[PDB]
Structure formats: structure tokens, C-alpha cells
Short mmCIF file of C-alpha atoms and ligand atoms in Angstrom, two decimals:
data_model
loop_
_atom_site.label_atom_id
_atom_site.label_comp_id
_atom_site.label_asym_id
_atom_site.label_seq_id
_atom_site.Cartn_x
_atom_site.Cartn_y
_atom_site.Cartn_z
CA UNK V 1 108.25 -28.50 70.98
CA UNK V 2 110.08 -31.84 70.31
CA UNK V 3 109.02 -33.41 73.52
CA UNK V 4 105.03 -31.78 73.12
CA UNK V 5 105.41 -34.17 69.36
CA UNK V 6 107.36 -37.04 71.14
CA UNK V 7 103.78 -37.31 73.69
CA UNK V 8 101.56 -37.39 70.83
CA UNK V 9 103.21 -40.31 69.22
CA UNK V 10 103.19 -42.02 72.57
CA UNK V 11 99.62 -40.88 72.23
CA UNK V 12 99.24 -42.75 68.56
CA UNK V 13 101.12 -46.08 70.22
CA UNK V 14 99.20 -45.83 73.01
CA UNK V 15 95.74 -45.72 71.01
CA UNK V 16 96.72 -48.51 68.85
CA UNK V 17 97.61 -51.34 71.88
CA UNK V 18 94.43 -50.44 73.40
CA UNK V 19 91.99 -50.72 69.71
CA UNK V 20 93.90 -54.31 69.35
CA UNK V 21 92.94 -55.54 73.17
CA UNK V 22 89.73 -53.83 72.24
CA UNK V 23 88.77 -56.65 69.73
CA UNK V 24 90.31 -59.39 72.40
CA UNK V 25 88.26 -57.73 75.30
CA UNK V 26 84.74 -58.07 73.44
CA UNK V 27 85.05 -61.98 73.56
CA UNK V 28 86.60 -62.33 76.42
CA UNK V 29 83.20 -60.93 77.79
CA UNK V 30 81.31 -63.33 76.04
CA UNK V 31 83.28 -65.97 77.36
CA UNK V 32 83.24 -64.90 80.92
CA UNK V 33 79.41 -64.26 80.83
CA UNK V 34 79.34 -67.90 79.51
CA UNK V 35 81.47 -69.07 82.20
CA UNK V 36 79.57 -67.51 85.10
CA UNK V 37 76.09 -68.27 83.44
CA UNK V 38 76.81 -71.69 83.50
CA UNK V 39 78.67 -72.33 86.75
CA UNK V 40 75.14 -70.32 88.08
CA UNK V 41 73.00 -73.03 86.69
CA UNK V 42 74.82 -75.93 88.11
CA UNK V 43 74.86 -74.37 91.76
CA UNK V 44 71.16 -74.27 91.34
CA UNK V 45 70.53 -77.77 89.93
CA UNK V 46 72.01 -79.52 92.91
CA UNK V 47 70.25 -77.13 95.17
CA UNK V 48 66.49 -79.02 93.56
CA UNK V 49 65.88 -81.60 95.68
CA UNK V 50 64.49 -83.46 92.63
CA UNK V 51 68.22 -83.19 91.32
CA UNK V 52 69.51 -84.50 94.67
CA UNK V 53 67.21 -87.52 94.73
CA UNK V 54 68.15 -88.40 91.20
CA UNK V 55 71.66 -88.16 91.86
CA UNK V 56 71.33 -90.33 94.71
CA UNK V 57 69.68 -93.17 92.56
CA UNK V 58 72.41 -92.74 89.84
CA UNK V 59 74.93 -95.65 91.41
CA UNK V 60 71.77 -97.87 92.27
CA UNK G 1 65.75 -84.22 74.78
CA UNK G 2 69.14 -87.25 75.03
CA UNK G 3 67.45 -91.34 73.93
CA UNK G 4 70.14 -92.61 76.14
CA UNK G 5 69.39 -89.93 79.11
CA UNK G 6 65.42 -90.91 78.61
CA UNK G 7 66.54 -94.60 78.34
CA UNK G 8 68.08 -93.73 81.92
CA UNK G 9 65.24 -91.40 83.75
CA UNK G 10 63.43 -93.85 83.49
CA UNK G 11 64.98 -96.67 85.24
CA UNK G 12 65.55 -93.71 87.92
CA UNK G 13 61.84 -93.43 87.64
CA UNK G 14 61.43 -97.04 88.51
CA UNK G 15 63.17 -96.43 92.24
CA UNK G 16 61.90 -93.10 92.92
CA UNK G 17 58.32 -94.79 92.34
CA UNK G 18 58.28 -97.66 95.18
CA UNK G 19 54.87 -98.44 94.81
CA UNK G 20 54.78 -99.74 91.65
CA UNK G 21 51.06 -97.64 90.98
CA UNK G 22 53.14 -95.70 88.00
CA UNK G 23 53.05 -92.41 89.35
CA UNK G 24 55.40 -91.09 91.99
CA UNK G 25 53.38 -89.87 94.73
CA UNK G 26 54.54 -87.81 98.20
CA UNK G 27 54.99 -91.66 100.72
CA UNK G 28 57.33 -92.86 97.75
CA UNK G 29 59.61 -90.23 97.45
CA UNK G 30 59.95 -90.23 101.45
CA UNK G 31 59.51 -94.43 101.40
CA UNK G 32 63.13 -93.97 98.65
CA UNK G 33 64.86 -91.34 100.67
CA UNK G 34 64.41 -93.21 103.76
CA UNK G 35 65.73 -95.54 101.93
CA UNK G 36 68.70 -93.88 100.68
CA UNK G 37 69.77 -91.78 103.02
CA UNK G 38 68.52 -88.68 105.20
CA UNK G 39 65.13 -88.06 104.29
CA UNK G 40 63.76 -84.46 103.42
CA UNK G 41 60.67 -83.42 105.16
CA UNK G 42 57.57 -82.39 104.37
CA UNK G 43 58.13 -78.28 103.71
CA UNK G 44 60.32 -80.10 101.20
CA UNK G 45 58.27 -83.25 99.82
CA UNK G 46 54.81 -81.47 99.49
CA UNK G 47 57.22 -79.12 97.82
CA UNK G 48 58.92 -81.29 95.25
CA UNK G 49 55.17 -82.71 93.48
CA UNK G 50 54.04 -79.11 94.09
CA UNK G 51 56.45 -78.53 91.22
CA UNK G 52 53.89 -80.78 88.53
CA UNK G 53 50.31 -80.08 88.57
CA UNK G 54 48.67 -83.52 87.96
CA UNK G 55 49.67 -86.84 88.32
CA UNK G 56 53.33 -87.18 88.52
CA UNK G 57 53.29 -89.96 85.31
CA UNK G 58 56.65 -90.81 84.05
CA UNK G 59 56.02 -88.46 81.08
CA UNK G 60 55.78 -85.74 83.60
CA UNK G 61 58.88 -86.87 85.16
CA UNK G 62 60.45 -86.14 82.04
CA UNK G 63 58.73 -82.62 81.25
CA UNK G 64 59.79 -80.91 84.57
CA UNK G 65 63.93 -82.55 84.53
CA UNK G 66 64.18 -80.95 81.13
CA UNK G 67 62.18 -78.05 81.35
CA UNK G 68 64.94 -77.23 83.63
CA UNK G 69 68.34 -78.49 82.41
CA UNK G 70 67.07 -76.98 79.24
CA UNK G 71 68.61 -73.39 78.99
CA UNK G 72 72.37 -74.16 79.86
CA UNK G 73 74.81 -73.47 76.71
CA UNK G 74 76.06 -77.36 75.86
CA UNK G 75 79.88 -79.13 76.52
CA UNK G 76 81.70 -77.26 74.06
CA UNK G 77 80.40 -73.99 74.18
CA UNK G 78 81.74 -73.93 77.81
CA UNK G 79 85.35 -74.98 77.38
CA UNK G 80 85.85 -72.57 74.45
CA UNK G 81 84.58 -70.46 76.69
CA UNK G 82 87.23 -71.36 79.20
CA UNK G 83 90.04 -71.55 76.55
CA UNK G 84 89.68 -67.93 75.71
CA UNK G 85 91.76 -67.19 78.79
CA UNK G 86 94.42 -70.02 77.85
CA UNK G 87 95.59 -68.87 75.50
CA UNK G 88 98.43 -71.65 75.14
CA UNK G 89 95.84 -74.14 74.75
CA UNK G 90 97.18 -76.19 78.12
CA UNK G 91 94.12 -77.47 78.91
CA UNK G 92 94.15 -76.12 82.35
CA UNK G 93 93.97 -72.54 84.10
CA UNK G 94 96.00 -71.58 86.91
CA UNK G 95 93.48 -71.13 90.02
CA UNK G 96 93.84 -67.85 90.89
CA UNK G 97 93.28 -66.28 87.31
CA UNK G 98 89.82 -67.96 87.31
CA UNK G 99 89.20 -66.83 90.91
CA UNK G 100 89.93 -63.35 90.21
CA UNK G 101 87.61 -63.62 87.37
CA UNK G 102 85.02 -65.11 88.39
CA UNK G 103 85.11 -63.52 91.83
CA UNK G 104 85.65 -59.83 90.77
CA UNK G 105 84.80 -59.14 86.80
CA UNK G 106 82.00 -59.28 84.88
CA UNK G 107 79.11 -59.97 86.88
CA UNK G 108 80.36 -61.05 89.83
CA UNK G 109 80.38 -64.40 92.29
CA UNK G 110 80.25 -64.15 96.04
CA UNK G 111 82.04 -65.78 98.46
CA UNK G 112 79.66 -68.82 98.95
CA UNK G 113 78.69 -69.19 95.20
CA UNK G 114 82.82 -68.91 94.91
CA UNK G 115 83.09 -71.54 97.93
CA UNK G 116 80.47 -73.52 96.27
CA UNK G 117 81.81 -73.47 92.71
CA UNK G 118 85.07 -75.21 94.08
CA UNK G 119 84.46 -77.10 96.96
CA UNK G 120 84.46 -80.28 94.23
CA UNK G 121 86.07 -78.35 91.37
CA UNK G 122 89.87 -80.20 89.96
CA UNK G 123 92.84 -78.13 91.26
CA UNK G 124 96.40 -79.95 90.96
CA UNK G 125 99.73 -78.04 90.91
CA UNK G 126 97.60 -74.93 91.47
CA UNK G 127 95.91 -75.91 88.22
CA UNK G 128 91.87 -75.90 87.79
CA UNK G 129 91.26 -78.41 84.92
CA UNK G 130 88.21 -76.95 83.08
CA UNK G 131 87.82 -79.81 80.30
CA UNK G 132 86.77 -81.89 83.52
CA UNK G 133 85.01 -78.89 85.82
CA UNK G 134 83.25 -78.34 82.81
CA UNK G 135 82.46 -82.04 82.08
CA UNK G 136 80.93 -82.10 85.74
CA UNK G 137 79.19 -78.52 85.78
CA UNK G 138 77.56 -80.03 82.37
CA UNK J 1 77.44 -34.78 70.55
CA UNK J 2 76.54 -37.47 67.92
CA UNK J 3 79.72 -38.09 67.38
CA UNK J 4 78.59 -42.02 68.78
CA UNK J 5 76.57 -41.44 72.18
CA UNK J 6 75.28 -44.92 71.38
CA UNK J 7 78.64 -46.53 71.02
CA UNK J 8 80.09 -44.77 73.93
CA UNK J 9 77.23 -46.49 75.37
CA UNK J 10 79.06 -49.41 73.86
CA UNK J 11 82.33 -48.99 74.97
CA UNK J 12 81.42 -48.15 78.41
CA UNK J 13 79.46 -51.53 79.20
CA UNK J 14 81.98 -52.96 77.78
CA UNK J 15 84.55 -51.88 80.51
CA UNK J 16 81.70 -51.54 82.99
CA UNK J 17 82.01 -55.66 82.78
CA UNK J 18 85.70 -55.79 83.04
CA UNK J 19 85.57 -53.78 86.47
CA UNK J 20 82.24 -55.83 87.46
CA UNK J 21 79.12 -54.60 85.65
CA UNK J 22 77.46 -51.84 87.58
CA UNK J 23 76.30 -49.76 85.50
CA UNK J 24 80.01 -47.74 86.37
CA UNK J 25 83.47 -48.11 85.23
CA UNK J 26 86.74 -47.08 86.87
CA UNK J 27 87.66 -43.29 85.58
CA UNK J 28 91.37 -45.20 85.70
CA UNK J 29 89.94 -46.91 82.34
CA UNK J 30 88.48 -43.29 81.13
CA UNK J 31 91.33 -43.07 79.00
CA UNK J 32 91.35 -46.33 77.44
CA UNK J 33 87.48 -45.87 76.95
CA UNK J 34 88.03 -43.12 74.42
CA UNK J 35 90.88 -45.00 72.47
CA UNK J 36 88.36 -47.47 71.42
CA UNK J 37 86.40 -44.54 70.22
CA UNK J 38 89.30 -43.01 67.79
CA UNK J 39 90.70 -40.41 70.20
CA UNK J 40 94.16 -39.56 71.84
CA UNK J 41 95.63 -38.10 74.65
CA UNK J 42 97.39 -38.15 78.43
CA UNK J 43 97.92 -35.06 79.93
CA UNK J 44 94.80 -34.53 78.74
CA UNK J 45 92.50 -36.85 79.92
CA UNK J 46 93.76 -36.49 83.40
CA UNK J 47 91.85 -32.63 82.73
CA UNK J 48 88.73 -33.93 82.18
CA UNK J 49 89.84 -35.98 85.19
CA UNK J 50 90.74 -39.42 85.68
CA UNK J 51 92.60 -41.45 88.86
CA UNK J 52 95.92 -39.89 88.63
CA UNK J 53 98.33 -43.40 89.19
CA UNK J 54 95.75 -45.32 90.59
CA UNK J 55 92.95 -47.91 90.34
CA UNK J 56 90.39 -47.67 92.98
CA UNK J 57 90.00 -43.67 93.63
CA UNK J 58 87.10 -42.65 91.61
CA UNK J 59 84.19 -44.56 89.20
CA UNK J 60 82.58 -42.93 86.40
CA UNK J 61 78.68 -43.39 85.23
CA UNK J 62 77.51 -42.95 81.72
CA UNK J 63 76.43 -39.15 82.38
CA UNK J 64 80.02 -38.28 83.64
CA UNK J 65 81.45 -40.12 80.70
CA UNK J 66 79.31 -38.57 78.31
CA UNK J 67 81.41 -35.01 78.34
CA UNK J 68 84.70 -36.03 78.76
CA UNK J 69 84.25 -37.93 75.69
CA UNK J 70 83.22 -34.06 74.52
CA UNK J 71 85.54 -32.97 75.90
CA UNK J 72 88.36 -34.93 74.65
CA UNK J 73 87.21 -35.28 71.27
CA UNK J 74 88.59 -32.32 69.68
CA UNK J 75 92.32 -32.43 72.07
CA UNK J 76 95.48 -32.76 70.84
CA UNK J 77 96.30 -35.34 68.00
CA UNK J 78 99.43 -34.95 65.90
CA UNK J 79 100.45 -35.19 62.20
CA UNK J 80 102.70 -36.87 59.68
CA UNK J 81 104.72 -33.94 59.31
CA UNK J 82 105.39 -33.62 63.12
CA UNK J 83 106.20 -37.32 63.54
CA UNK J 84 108.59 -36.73 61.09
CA UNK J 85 110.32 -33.48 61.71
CA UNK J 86 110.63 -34.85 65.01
CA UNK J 87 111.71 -38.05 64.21
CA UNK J 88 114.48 -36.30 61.50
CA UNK J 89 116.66 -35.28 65.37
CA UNK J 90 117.27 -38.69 66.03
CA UNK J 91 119.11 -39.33 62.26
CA UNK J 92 122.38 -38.19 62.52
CA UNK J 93 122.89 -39.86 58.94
CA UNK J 94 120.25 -38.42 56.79
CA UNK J 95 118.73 -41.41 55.11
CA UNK J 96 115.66 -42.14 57.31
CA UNK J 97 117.38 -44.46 60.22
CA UNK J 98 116.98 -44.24 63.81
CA UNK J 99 118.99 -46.81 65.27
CA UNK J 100 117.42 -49.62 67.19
CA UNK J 101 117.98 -48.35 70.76
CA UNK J 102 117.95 -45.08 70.12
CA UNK J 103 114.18 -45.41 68.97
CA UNK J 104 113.08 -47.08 72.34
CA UNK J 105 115.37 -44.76 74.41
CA UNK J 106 113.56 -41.69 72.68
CA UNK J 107 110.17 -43.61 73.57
CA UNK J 108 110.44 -44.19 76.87
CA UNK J 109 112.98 -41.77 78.00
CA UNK J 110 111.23 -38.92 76.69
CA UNK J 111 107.97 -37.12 76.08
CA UNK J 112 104.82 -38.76 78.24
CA UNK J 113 107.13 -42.02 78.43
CA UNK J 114 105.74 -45.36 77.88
CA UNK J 115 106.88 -48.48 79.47
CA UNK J 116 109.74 -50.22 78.04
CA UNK J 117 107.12 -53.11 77.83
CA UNK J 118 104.76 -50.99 75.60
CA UNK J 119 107.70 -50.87 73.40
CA UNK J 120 108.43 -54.20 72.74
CA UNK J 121 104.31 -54.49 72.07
CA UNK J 122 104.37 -51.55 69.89
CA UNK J 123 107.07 -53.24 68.00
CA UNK J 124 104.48 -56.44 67.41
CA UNK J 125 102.89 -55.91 64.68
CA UNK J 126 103.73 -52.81 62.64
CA UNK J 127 106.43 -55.49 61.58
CA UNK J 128 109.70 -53.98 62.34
CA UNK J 129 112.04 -55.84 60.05
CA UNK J 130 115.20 -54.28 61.56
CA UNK J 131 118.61 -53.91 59.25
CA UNK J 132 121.66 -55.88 59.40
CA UNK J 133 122.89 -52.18 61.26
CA UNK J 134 120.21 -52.51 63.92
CA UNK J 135 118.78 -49.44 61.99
CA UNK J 136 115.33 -48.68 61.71
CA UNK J 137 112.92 -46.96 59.35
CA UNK J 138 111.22 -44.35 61.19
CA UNK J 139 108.80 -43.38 58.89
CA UNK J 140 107.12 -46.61 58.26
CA UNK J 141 107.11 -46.60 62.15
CA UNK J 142 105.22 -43.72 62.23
CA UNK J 143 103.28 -44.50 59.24
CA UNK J 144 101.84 -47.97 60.75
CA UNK J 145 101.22 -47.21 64.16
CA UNK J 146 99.55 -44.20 62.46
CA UNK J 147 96.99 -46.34 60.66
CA UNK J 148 95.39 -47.29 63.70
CA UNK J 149 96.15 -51.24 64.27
CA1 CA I 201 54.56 -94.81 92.23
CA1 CA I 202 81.85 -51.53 86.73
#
């Protein structure tokens, strides 16, 4: 019986580190999407040759 | 929208424009890229002022280079987005927790946008510097 | 169930992202997904099924998620008076002290073990001001990991 208690408190612990990551997990989404959004837009900019010929003229 | 970006565009637009007529017409943009380096072609060029119904003015020249860099989330929006991960604030991340992020959560990269995003991106002492990556992404 | 289908729905894109969104995620994170929801278990959730030590066997879609959730949801979740009468063994003393290591021995030792890692983390905040003795108090232990985080 003590042991069968013993895995529900692991099961209490176990429910609480998860709940806390929970909150850190939600950003970390937003963040990423962010990330990857961005670094998506860039790729595609100097893919448009009107970007490339800009760049080109940007020392001159 | 940027004075100091339309204060810029517009010198560019000066180049670009070799004929001096005021609007930048298909022999000009091949008569500049000649000029600068390998040309594009012509499945390209016809392409490029197929992108602005009507006369490419310099106003138009304007519409079309910021209806286009006009969506992406601004400088510091995408560096708090990066410092989420460091959590120590060293302005940094080591390279392969960005790759396996990038690469393999959320929605995904593949190989060539992942060989693409750092073919120029700053790596030193297995270090990617994001305050600069994202300075150049932006 | 209305329980929360919709945040269910919530919880699940949420770790459909972390394991690249797909509309699927890992049934390794099944577990997880419900503790986000207010639910325990273990032994359990490995009987509504879920990747038994590993990452990479089986992925779950919403459907298949939707009645292990049901499932789950009325399991096996302890009380105060169980934490404590189990927790009374362990004081040899009889003024509510568990000793330092004999609290993380009986964590991860015992029962459905958790890592000696998850102990020190468990230990983060609750607050766990231990005596001059290296005693604990087991009861606000099981009092503040019982009020969720
Ligand atoms: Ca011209
Ligand atoms: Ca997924």
C-alpha cells in the first residue's frame, strides 16, 4: 500500500514540473514561430532579383 | 515607410535607371547589370517590371520594395525572440541548439533552407551570434 | 467529454509544435499532455498506451488523444491523508521530520521512482527551507507540491 501512495506523490511532483514548463513552453513557441517566420522571409528577399540588383548598387 | 531608407532608394533608383527618361525600363536594368556583374536574362528581366503594372516611376519603385519587406516582425521583436532560448542573456546561442530547433521543431526547415540560413550566418567558438544574424536577416 | 475537448485541442498543438507541427504529437508526450490538463498518473497512462521508454515508436492524432484523455481523467490521484500516513513511516521521531536524504532516497528509490534530477527540481520552488538538522517538514512538502505549482 505504501509504495501504491509513494507513486501517486511521484504522480503530484511529476504533474507540477510539467504545469511550470507548461507556461515556459507556450512562449517558447511564439518565439520559435518568430524565429523561423523571419529567417523564411529573408531567404526569399534575396531570392527577388529586384533585391539582388539593389544589393548590388548598395556599395556604388 | 524609413525617410532615411527613401532618402536611399532613391539614389539606388538613380543607377538602376541608366537612361535618365525617369522610369526604369527592361534595356536599363540589363544596360546596369551588365554593368555590374552577370546579367539576368530575359525569363528574368521581362519578369522583374512584370512585377508593376504601369510605368515603373520612382514612386512605383517604392510601392513594390515595401509592399514586400512590409510583413516581417521588426529588430527587436526577433532577438527577444532569440533570447528566449538564452536564457543567461549571453548574447549568443550555441550552434547546435538553434540547429536542432530550427531544423526539427516547430514548423520545420529543410536541409537547403537550413544550408541557406547559415551559409553567411556568425558562428565563433561554436557560437551563432543572433544580435548580428538578426541585424543581417533584418 | 466536456471536460475541455477545446483545450485538449490546446494542449495538443501545443506539443504537436514541439515535435514539429503535423497535426500529431509523440504518444511519448501523451503523458505530459494530460498534466497540463490537471490529471495524474504512470502506470496508467502507459494503459491507455504510450511509447514504453522511448521517443520515436508511436504518434498520436487528436482523435486518439481524445479518449485517453477519457480515459485517464477519472485514474488514480491521491489525498492529503495518504501523503501523510505514508509520509508518518519515514519519522522515526514523531514531530513531522523526514530527514533530508531520507526524503530523496524514499523518492527515487521507491514507488514509480523519479530521477534524482526531478528531485532537486521538485525541491525549487515549494521552498524547502531545510533545518539546522538537515530535517525536513514533510507536510508542507506535500502540501505545496499539492497545490499544483
Ligand atoms: Ca530610366
Ligand atoms: Ca508533431
Amino acid at each position: 500500500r505504501l509504495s501504491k501512495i509513494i507513486s501517486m506523490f511521484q504522480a503530484h511532483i511529476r504533474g507540477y514540473l510539467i504545469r511550470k514548463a507548461y507556461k515556459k513552453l507556450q512562449d517558447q513557441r511564439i518565439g520559435l514561430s518568430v524565429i523561423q517566420r523571419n529567417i523564411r522571409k529573408w531567404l526569399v528577399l534575396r531570392n527577388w532579383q529586384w533585391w539582388k540588383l539593389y544589393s548590388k548598387v548598395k556599395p556604388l | 515607410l524609413p525617410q532615411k531608407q527613401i532618402q536611399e532608394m532613391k539614389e539606388a533608383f538613380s543607377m538602376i535607371d541608366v537612361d535618365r527618361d525617369g522610369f526604369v525600363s527592361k534595356e536599363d536594368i540589363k544596360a546596369i547589370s551588365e554593368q555590374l556583374g552577370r546579367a539576368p536574362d530575359d525569363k528574368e528581366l521581362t519578369a522583374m517590371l512584370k512585377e508593376a503594372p504601369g510605368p515603373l516611376n520612382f514612386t512605383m519603385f517604392l510601392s513594390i520594395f515595401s509592399d514586400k519587406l512590409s510583413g516581417t516582425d521588426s529588430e527587436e521583436t526577433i532577438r527577444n525572440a532569440f533570447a528566449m532560448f538564452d536564457e543567461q542573456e549571453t548574447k549568443k546561442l550555441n550552434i547546435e541548439y538553434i540547429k536542432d530547433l530550427l531544423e526539427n521543431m516547430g514548423d520545420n526547415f529543410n536541409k537547403d533552407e537550413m544550408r541557406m540560413t547559415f551559409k553567411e550566418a556568425p558562428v565563433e567558438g561554436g557560437k551563432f551570434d543572433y544580435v548580428k544574424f538578426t541585424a543581417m536577416i533584418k | 467529454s466536456q471536460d475541455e475537448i477545446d483545450d485538449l485541442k490546446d494542449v495538443f498543438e501545443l506539443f504537436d509544435f514541439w515535435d514539429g507541427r503535423d497535426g500529431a504529437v509523440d504518444a511519448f508526450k501523451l503523458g505530459d499532455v494530460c498534466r497540463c490538463l490537471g490529471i495524474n498518473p504512470r502506470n496508467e497512462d502507459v494503459f491507455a498506451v504510450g511509447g514504453t521508454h522511448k521517443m520515436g515508436e508511436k504518434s498520436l492524432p487528436f482523435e486518439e488523444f481524445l479518449p485517453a484523455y477519457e480515459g485517464l481523467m477519472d485514474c488514480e490521484q491521491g489525498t492529503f491523508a495518504d501523503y501523510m500516513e505514508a509520509f508518518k513511516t519515514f519519522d522515526r521521531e514523531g514531530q513531522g521530520f523526514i530527514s533530508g536524504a531520507e526524503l530523496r532516497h524514499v523518492l527515487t528509490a521507491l514507488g514509480e521512482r523519479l530521477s534524482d534530477e526531478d528531485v532537486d527540481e521538485i525541491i525549487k520552488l515549494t521552498d524547502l527551507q531545510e533545518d539546522l538538522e538537515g530535517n525536513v517538514k514533510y507536510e508542507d512538502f506535500v502540501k505545496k507540491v499539492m497545490a499544483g505549482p
